Design a protein around this nucleic acid. Sequence first.
RNA 1: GUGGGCCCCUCCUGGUAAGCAGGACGGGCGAGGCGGGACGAUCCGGACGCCGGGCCAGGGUGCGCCGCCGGGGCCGGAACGGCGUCGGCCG
RNA 2: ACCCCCCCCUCCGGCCCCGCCGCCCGCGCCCCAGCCCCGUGCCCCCUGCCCGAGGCGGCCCCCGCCCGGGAGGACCACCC
Lengths: 173, 184, 128, 195, 270, 123
Amino acid sequence: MMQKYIVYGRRLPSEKFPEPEVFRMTIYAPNEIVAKSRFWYHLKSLKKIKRTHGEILDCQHIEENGDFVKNFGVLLRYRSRVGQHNMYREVRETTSARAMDKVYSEMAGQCRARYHDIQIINVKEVADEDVRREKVAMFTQKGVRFPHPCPYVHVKRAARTARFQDRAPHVPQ
Amino acid sequence: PLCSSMTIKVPTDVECTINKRVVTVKGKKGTLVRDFSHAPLDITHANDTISVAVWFPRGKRNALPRTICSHIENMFKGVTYGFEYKMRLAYAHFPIAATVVDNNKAIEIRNFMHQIKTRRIECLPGVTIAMSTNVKDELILRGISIEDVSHTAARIHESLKVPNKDLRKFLDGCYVSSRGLQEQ
Amino acid sequence: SYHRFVEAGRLVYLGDGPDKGKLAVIVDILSTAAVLIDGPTTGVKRQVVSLRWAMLTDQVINISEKPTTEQLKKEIEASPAIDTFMNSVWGKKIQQQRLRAKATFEDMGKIAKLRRERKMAMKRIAMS
Amino acid sequence: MSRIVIDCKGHILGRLSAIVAKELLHGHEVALVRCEKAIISGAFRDVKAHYLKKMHKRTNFNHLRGPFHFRAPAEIVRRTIRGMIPYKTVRGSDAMSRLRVYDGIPPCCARYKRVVCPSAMAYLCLRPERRRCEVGRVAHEIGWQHAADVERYEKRRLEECDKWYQDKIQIDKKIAEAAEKDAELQRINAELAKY
Amino acid sequence: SHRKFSCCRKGNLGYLPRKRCTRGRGRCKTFPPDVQGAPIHLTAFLGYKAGCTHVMRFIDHRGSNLHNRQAIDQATIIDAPPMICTAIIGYAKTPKGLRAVTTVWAAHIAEPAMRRFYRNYFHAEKTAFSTYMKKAADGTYIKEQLGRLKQHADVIRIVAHTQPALTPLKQKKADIMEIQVNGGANVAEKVDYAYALMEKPISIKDVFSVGAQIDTISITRGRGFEGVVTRWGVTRLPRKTRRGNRKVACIGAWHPANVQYTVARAGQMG
Amino acid sequence: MEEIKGKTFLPAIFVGYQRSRAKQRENVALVKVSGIYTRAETDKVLGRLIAIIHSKSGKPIFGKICRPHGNSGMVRARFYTNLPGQLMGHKVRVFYDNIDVGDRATPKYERLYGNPNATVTYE
RNA sequence: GUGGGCCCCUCCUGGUAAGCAGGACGGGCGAGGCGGGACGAUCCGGACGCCGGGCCAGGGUGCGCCGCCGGGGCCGGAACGGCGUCGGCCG
RNA sequence: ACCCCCCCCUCCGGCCCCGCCGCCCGCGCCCCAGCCCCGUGCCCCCUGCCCGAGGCGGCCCCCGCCCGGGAGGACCACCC
Ligand SMILES: [K+]
Ligand SMILES: [K+]
Ligand SMILES: [K+]
Ligand SMILES: [K+]
Ligand SMILES: [K+]
Ligand SMILES: [K+]
Ligand SMILES: [K+]
Ligand SMILES: [K+]
Ligand SMILES: [K+]
Ligand SMILES: [K+]
Ligand SMILES: [K+]
Ligand SMILES: [K+]
Ligand SMILES: [K+]
Ligand SMILES: [Mg+2]
Ligand SMILES: [Mg+2]
Ligand SMILES: [Mg+2]
Ligand SMILES: [Mg+2]
C-alpha cells in the first residue's frame, strides 16, 4: 500500500534569512497526509523547525516500473520496551514500496513494532554477489527449484464450498 | 537452505529395497526391516547409493537425515557381519550362577548376592545368548539387529540390582564390556 | 519423491484472486511464498502472486532467464505445452467449467430437469 | 429428506461436531459411523489428563444428580454435539432426536452411502509435527469395555465387503455397456451443451 | 475447623443402597472363565440351606501352630436334590456385550417347571408350550435349532430346574437357573454335551468335588425398619441427651446446604 | 396445492427470523438457497417468487426474495403473512417458472397501510 | 425542593496498604431509555413521541448465536534461571 | 509407584431370548494411503419436482387381583 513521495520544505523566511535553505527527503507512506506529517517529524527533530515555523514546498509522488526482481537492503531503527536498536534487513521484491511493505509486516510480526515506532535510515538496491543474508541470497542463484511448500491449501479452499464429497481428495505433489 | 541431505554408499554384498519409507535389507545373515514412516523423508535410491533429504527445515527437522542414515548403516553392518555384545558378571564372595535355557533363547540367573529369588530373562526375537567359550563369567549376545541385542543386554543389567545399599561399595551386576561387530 | 517443482518456466493454474480460473507461466521466484508470473496468451498481466493461489501443473516451458512480455509470448507460442494441457483430462474439465460458469436462472431450470431424466434413465437401465 | 451418513474416520472432533450441529438445525437426519476412529489433536497423554479432569466433577451430596460421563466414543461424540446444540428447548430437542452415532458400522447402516468432510479431516487440518490420537484409545483408558469386540466385528465385515466388491466390478461392466440407449444419448448431448 | 482426632468412617459405601432385594432369589451375576482345552464340567448348582453342626478334623497344615493337632470346625449342611436339565441357551460376544441366539426347549416338560409359569395352578387354564410340544414331537426341529447354535454362538448354558417334591419345603413350583458349560475343545463339543444332558437329572456330586472351593449366593435375614446404631454401627450418645441417644448428632455442616449420601440414616435393614 | 402442483422448483430452507442477540424481527425471514454460496451469486434468485407449506390445512403461503444477507448466499424474504415459529427447519420452494398469484404474495403492511390514500369508497 | 452524596479521568495529602480516610479543574450516576463490555448504577458508543424504509457508531464475524474472506510474519504475577525456537547488534 | 482407571462386588431406566399368539414403514454398500499424491485438482446437486411391493434394514402390539400363611413386614410391597 506504501507509496513513494519526495517532499521539499523550508523555514519561513525572515529579515536575517532572505532565501533560507531547502531540504528534501524521500518518504514511504500510505498517503500524502501521513507523508507530510512524517517529513515535519524529521525536520523538526533534525533541523529544529516545527510545522509552525516553515512551509512544505512540494510533495511529489513517484510511480515505479516492475517486471524484474531486485534485492533491497533497508537500514532502520525501531523502539522496544527496553530501549532503541539498529537493524538491517534484506528482501526480494519488485519495487521499493513493496519491499517496504514486506519490511513493515515482518517487523509487526517478529518484533511487534508498529509504523510510528520505526525510522528508516537507508533503502538501497544490493547486487547479487553483494548480498549478506541467507533467506535472500538463496534465491539469487541460477536454477533454484523446490516442490510446492503448501499444496494442502488448494484442497482445503475447494472443500470450503464442496463441504460434502464421496471420497477424501488427494494432495497432488 | 531449501534442503538438507546426507548420502551413503550401498556395499556390494547386500540387496536393498525402499517402498514408502519402508526399508528392507537382505544378505547372508538374515533379512531386516524397518519403518521410518513416522518422519517426513525423501529417500532416493539410484546408481548404488542411498540419499536422505528433508525439504524446508525449520528446527529439529534438520536433525533427521544423519539419524535415518546411521540407522541404515547399522542395518548393513548387522546383515553383513552381525553384532555381538560381551557382558561380564562381576561379584564378590557370592558367585553369580547363570545358565542358558529355552534352547539359547533365554538366560536364567541364580544366587546374585545369595538370594532365593531367581531371574529369568528372555531374548528379544532374533538374538541368541551363549556362555563364553574363552574366559569365565562372560556372556555373548549375538544378533543382526543392534536394537534387539542392546535392549536384551540392558534388560539383564536392570534385572540385577542391589537395594538399600551404597552402590559405590556394593558393586555387583552384569555389565557390558565389549560392544561391536563379529569376527569370523 | 516429488515430480512437480517451483521453477522458471513452470505452468500454473491460478486458483484465487482477481485472475482465478486462468493459466500462466512463472518467470521468477521471490522467496518461499511468492512468484512473479506472466501469461500473455491467456490474458494475465505480469505480477507477483502468492504460491497459495497457484496450482502447479506438470508442464515446464523452455524460456530464457529474464524475458520481456512480447518475447515471452513468442517463446510460449513456440512451445506446445498449453495445447497438451488442454488435451489432457484436467483441461477438458476446465473447458466445461467455463460453459457451466455463465448460466442464468432459466438455464438452471433446464439443467435440473435434464439431470432428473439422467437419474431416471440410469435407473431404468441398472434395473436390467 | 434423505439421511446423510458420515464416516468418522479421519475427522477432527470439534470441527465435525460444528458441521453436524448446523446440519441438524436445518432439519436434516444425520448418522455418523466409526466414532472410535475420529481424531483429537495433541499428545495422547494430554488428552487423557483432560478427560480425567473432566471425570472428577460430580455433585458432592448425591452423584445421581450430577454430570454423567459416558465412556464410549459414540456418546463422547454425542455429548460434544449437545455442547453445540441448545437442547433444553423444543427446537434443540428435535435436533437431538434427528441424530445417530455409532461405533463401527452396524447392519442398519451397512448399505447406506457414506460421505466425508475434508475441510475437517486431520491430514488437511493438522501440521505434520503436531501429535494426535484417536478417540477409541482414550475411551479404552477411561473405561470403555468393548474395543476388542468392535475390532473383531470390523475385521469380519471388511472381509465380507471385499468379497462383494469383486462381483460389483463385473456388475458395473454390464451397467456401463449401456452406451446403447439413444433415448439417453439424445440428452447426454443436451447435458454437454450446458456443461 | 478440622476434626481434632483421627477416626475412620462407619460402614462400607460399596453396598448401597440398603434396599430390599428385588431379584426374587440369589442370581448368579458372573460365571467362572472358560479355558480353551480344559476338560468339560458344569459350574453351578442350587440348594436349600438346611442347618449347622461342628466336626473334628486332623489338621495337616505346615508352619502353623495346628500342624499335627486336631481342630473343631463349624460346618453348614445344604440339601441338594438332583436337578433336571430342560433347555439350552447360546450367546454371542458382540459390540454390545452378550446377546442371545435362541433357546431350545425339551420335548416333554415336568409339573414343577410348568407350575413356575403360572400364578395359581389349579385355576389357570393350561396353554403353555401347547404348540411347542406338538411341533417338536419329531426331533428333527430340535436338531436344526441346535445346528444354528453350533453354527454361531460363543457361550453355551443349560437351563435346569429344581424339584421340590423331594424336600420338606412348602412350595411346589421349581426354581429355574442356567448353569454354564465351560471347558472342552470347542463350541460344538459343548453343544453335543448339552444335548446329551437334555431331559436328564444332574447330581451335585457331578458338579463339585471334595476339598475344592465354592461361592455361596443368597438373600440375608430380614429385620425391617431399623435405626442408625444397629443399621450402621455409629456410637450411642451420652445418657443425659434430652431427646434420645440412638442417633447421629450432626448430619452435615452448614455448607454444602444439603444432606450428603455418606451420612448414616434409618431404614430397611436386612 | 392444486395450483402449484406441476411447478418444478429449486430448494431452500427457512432457518430463522432476522435478529440480533437482543431483538428479533418477525417481518423478515432468513432463507438458505442451495448452490448459492456467495453474496454475488444471489442476484439470480433476487426478486423471485417463493412459497412455504403450512402443515395445518396443507396450504401454501407465497412470498418474494427481497435482499442478500452476509457474504455467503443467505437471503431475506417477506411472506404474504408473517410466519409461525413452528415452521423452522422446513423447506422453501424457489420456482423456476412464472405464476400469477396477483396480490397474494405481498406483505401485509404494504397491502394495507401502504398509503395510496385509499379512500374507503362505500360504493 | 435541597443543605448524608458517590464514581471516572488527570493532580495531590496521611497510611505497609485498603473496594481506607481527606482535598482540585472537567465529566458522569444520582435523575439517562437503547446496543456492546458473558454477567455489573458509573466502562465503550449513543442520551429517548408513535411507525415504515435506508445508512451505519462502539464491539465483533467456528457451533450455541445475527455476521468473512484474502495476504505477510510468529507460534493474575517478581527477583532470577533456559545449548526451546525465530530474529538482531558488537568484536 | 500405598496414587489413577478397569475386573470382582451393590443398585440398575431400558433392552434381548423364549412361551399363547396380527400391523405399519424405507429403498442408498469397496477398501487404504497423503515426503507417491499412481495419474487426481471429481461426483451428488428433483424427497416429488412423479418416486412407490420380493431381499435387506426398522416399527407397534402381546400377559390380574382379592383371599390366608410366612423364611417377608409401619401401612404397602415381597416369597409361597
Ligand atoms: K471441628
Ligand atoms: K469437632
Ligand atoms: K453417633
Ligand atoms: K450439609
Ligand atoms: K445419607
Ligand atoms: K453419618
Ligand atoms: K436417622
Ligand atoms: K498504619
Ligand atoms: K437527568
Ligand atoms: K444526568
Ligand atoms: K530467546
Ligand atoms: K477412586
Ligand atoms: K477386589
Ligand atoms: Mg427437658
Ligand atoms: Mg469508600
Ligand atoms: Mg446484556
Ligand atoms: Mg451463524
